[PDB]
């Protein structure tokens, strides 16, 4: 069909310039104009939804969407055949579930959308079905490749064939499908969700994405009790993308790519060399500094990872560095960015929790600086026990040109920081700030900026929300079985003799998540585990933006163990290292960022006394 | 089929919009700031193209195109109904062929879109088939409601089976359709445009519509004679429309519906009573004065009739003057609209004869204003012959205030004259600089619109725009048909002892319409006998633009002209008043109009010497 096979890029990347445009309306109505406007917001969220629909789309048609792959690794091929068949036949009953849902909560659509003229809600629950349909269709164009390649036993026509008969039975004989419900054969009872979960686990194990599995516990835990019910808790799947502190995530993620371009991170990082380049450490210092620049700007580390280290490197080689120490080096200060507001994470954790984003950030600002002194104590004590030189002291003028030449880049992070801690902006309109900002600067200022790259650089945000999406709409459906049966009520029973002491507590979570991360990814693992922590927190009486910040910095620490440590893997990619050069060189770097765990875990007040202040 | 109930009206306002938002876009910067734009004039172009494809879409919908009623209104009710499931047949074999067409132009669009990126021309060419489908749908709708009165006997379900049998032949084995070739079984030779002709007219007088009537015989020659090449000419149907000048028809009608509101009109009348009501003649002054001044913004002549009429005829009867003659004026004063610029008819006229809009524009405005001066004559010799008394003089302060009232409405017919006649805008950038001029005056000074309002006047004025455009488009394929088989050339050569005497040919031409505006309406009379006359004129040497002003005041006479004259129906509805008294009525008053129509028939240099100085 390749007359459709671009329709959700562009489609997508217009919705986003119109939703990037209302919103600089609003502010810069509100702000200048002191004319504030009551449907922007309602507007935005309205195609948010759409874009959102349409990314989960596009990552469906390229099989990216996130799953653990610890055991996959470990199997032989013909096994793993087996295991590839079933998980595309999963997929394919949750496609098929999406539509179905998404038909009966568009006729079930009532209310109005007041501060919109009084539009009908069908136009936010419309989104769900009509994209379903694209997603099934592109799902099934994927099949034929999976099959040809020799991955899986199935063809593309088998599961054409299946898709009609399913439609054939639900528009002419629904009342068929009452012998799926477990409910009729055995009654479990309250070891209803205990088996959800377990087989939950497995199902995530062999291979099946996170998105879809949280999906499909569900559904079975409702099928094992009462299906009816589930109609109630349908409607959370679209409510849950209508969401405004949600928006924030794409315009972060578009301002990091806009602003990883090279001629910007050239410029930053002469800076940092002309600023830090010739006191003892040298160039471990310069390194951090331009990590630390680099964190105010972009949401995420393994992009600072990917974007600065073939220049790092070359400077700390040449400067008589080690191999092992300069990669230990790049790896571990790559964590700076997503504790250092702004961070996906933290976004992620605020919208789970329903927490406010602001508090989170001014929280997690602390971490980060005591992070990064603790590695320049730690690269000034190796540098100087090793014996490395010292570089020439840089003149003055050299300092002024750099700075002069670095001055608009290196503004961006002191506006976002002064708009969100200020109370000036929200974060959203910070990120929308940011964004117009950075577009600015590279189309007039340093001209390293096009119409096309630009729809480029959206298309490409959208495509990466587009994953983070459908985790965030599957983990609100889960919620929902997690809250109604109680379990976290049950878990603080199980575990008797251990409250009135949150410190034993806290150690045993923090064990857990250490322990975890060894193997699995950070970001599939804060879908993972989240869900079950947060109820847990609240039944012991800890408060939630230490606890918010305290598993964000534990999952961070996840990138730098072995074995499975994106970090360590990007690096010995960029600076041509074996990996274990690479987990030598950080092995002397953990020290610091487990001290600075344990002070925190010890001590709330660290973390909780700047927020209250500011908020 | 519920949720697509608004689908073209909705898409098209949006398209409206946007095209009316990007020409606003051009001309500012390209007259303020000096900066030309490239992209705006092609981006405007491909939307309308949709525009108008929407807009046709709704018209086949609600049974709205343009036909012949003149024989059709002497029939039984039995015999109109076996006509009128023949036009059903009829045009449902047409929309078939449109989508037909559509598929293969689109299939053999190859050329790219200079001037916008080098995008492919077939962004333009797939409006076609893809709205094509929708009309097809929307007659299958109509079927229903056309069957359920008992009107037709043909239900849905048998156009429903009669397409899908076509599109499986169609798909699977179209060398089958290869038997439907009239020159298989007969060669007619030369006959062939004279036999189609001939069904033409047989066809259009049984009641089919203009734009499909044109279509079908030019279907009927080239299966006559050679069917391939129909390919070949099926590429002007979707060329027809991406034009420039046809582009300002929408943004005139809108400005008129936008002008046409209460409030407006009473200032403006206000004011012309308070200026022309004091002398002998008075109100019919006075009638007048308000009608050329609201043809400088209206496009039409029925619109000012039944925008006006219930307010003129009340001061006129008042006054002391007859029924008669107030009905005769109110009829006779609308025809000043179509010939003061802007008009619809010169537009279209330019259209078909590729002459220039503004050429036109220029030169229809001195009939425009002899015909005004010699009605206000007509009206001074009637009023003082029967003795009507004469009102009170109007003092000075009562003209102030009703000029500081409607100053700013009467202001636009300067704008536009200005605008077009200096040189400084083209018919286009006039139309949509009006138009702005008239939605900030209403939205501000007068506080008369809203965003409502303004949304349903776009959908209006394109729902007006979707009849013109099948029209254009059917008549532009049938002038292939007219110019391959010269069948000007050989209408010259029997009309032979004419030649060298222009005179004798211009007066043949007059009595032919003159006769035939007695039957058709004026608007489906210009497409009927335009396409033909145009190249007879170019035979003769006749000039085009004398041949345009004059064919537009000769088809203009027509709506007075009993059996069938529009004015005479508004007139008598609005007035309230048998349509026989308005008719004696408008008889004295169309001596002027005759004697106008001499005098510019027989001394040409009275129409072409103002658009020389000018241009
Ligand atoms: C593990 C995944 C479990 C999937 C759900 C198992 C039972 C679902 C069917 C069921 O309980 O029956 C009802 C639910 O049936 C469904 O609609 C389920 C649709 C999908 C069924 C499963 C598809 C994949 C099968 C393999 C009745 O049908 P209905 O809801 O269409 O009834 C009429 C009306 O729509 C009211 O809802
Ligand atoms: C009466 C039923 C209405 C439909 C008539 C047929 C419409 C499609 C005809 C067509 O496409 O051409 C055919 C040829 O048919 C004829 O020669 C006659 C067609 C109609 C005859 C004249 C109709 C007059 C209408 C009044 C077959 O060749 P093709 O053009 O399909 O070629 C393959 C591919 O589709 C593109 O080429
Ligand atoms: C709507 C999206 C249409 C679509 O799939 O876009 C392309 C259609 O080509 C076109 O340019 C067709 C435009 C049709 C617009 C309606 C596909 O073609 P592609 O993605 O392989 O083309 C690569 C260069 N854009
Ligand atoms: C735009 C796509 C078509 C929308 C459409 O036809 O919906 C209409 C409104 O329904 C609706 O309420 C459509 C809601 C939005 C549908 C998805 C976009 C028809 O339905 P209607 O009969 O209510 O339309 C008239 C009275 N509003
Ligand atoms: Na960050
Ligand atoms: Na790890
Ligand atoms: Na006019
Ligand atoms: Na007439």
């Known amino acids: 069909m390749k007359y459709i096979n671009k329709l959700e890029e562009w489609l997508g990347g217009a919705l986003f310039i119109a939703i990037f445009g209302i919103l600089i309306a609003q502010i810069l109505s509100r702000q200048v104009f002191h004319s504030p406007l009551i449907w922007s917001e309602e507007l935005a969220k309205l195609l948010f939804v759409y874009v959102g629909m349409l990314g989960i789309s596009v990552a469906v048609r390229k099989q990216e969407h996130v799953f653990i792959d610890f055991l996959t690794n470990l199997m032989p091929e013909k096994i793993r055949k087996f295991t590839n068949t079933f998980v595309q036949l999963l997929v394919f009953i949750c496609i098929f579930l999406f539509i179905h849902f998404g038909i009966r909560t568009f006729n079930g659509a009532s209310f109005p959308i007041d501060a919109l003229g009084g539009i009908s809600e069908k136009w936010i629950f419309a989104a769900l079905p009509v994209v379903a349909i694209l997603m099934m269709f592109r799902f099934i164009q994927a099949q034929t490749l999976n099959f040809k390649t020799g991955k899986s036993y199935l063809p593309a026509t088998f599961f054409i064939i299946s898709a009609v008969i399913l439609f054939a039975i639900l528009f002419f004989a629904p009342d068929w499908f009452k012998v799926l419900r477990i409910s009729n054969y055995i009654k479990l009872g309250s ?30 835990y409702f099928s094992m009790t009462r299906w009816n019910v589930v109609n109630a808790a349908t409607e959370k799947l679209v409510y849950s993308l209508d969401s405004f502190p949600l928006l924030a995530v794409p315009f972060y993620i578009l301002t990091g790519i806009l602003m990883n371009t090279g001629g910007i991170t050239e410029r930053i990082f002469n800076f940092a060399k002309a600023l830090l380049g010739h006191y003892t450490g040298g160039m471990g210092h310069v390194n951090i500094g331009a990590s630390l620049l680099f964190s105010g700007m972009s949401g995420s580390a393994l992009a600072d990872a990917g974007g600065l280290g073939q220049l790092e490197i070359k400077a700390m080689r040449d400067a008589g560095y080690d191999d092992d120490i300069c990669g230990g080096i790049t790896a571990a200060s790559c964590i700076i960015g997503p504790l250092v507001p702004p961070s996906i994470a933290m976004i992620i954790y605020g919208v789970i929790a329903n927490e406010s984003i602001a508090k989170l950030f001014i929280a997690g600002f602390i971490p980060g600086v005591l992070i990064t002194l603790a590695l320049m104590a730690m690269n000034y004590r190796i540098a100087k026990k090793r014996g490395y030189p010292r570089t020439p002291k840089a003149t003055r003028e050299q300092l002024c040109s750099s700075f002069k030449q670095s001055f608009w880049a290196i503004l961006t992070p002191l506006l976002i920081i002064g708009g969100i801690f200020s109370g000036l902006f929200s974060p959203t309109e910070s990120a929308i700030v940011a964004a117009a900002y950075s577009v600015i600067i590279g189309k007039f200022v340093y001209k390293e900026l096009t119409l096309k790259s630009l729809f480029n650089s959206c298309i490409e945000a959208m495509a990466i929300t587009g994953v983070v999406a459908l985790m965030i709409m599957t983990v609100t459906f889960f919620g929902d079985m997690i809250a109604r049966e109680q379990v976290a009520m049950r878990v603080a029973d199980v575990f008797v003799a251990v409250a009135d002491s949150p410190l034993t507590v806290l150690i045993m979570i923090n064990a857990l998540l250490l ?41 961070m620490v996840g990138i730098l163990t072995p074995p499975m440590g994106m970090a360590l893997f990007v690096v010995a990619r960029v600076g041509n290292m074996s ?28 973390i909780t006394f700047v927020p209250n202040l500011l908020i």
């Open 515 to 555: 322990f975890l991360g060894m193997f699995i990814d950070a970001l599939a693992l804060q879908f993972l585990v989240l869900p079950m922590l947060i109820p847990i927190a609240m039944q012991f009486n800890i408060d939630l933006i230490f606890f918010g910040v305290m598993t964000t910095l534990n999952m």
């Open 579 to 606: 990996v274990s050069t690479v987990t030598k060189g950080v092995l002397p770097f953990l020290i610091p960022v487990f001290v600075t765990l344990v002070l925190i875990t010890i001590f709330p007040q660290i």
């Open 191 to 220: 070891s209803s969700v205990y088996v959800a979960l377990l087989v939950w686990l497995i199902i995530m194990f062999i291979g099946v994405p996170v998105g879809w599995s949280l999906f499909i516990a569900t559904l079975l």
